Amino acid sequence: XCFXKTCX
């Protein structure tokens, strides 16, 4: 779960 600005 880390894709560009959508990341955690």
Query: Which amino acid, 1?
Result: X
DSSP the chain: -EETTEE-
Q: How many CA atoms are closer than 13 Å to the CA of 5, on its beta-carbon side?
A: 0
Radius of gyration of the chain (CA): 4
Distance CA 8, CA 2 (A): 6
Query: Which amino acid, 6?
Result: T
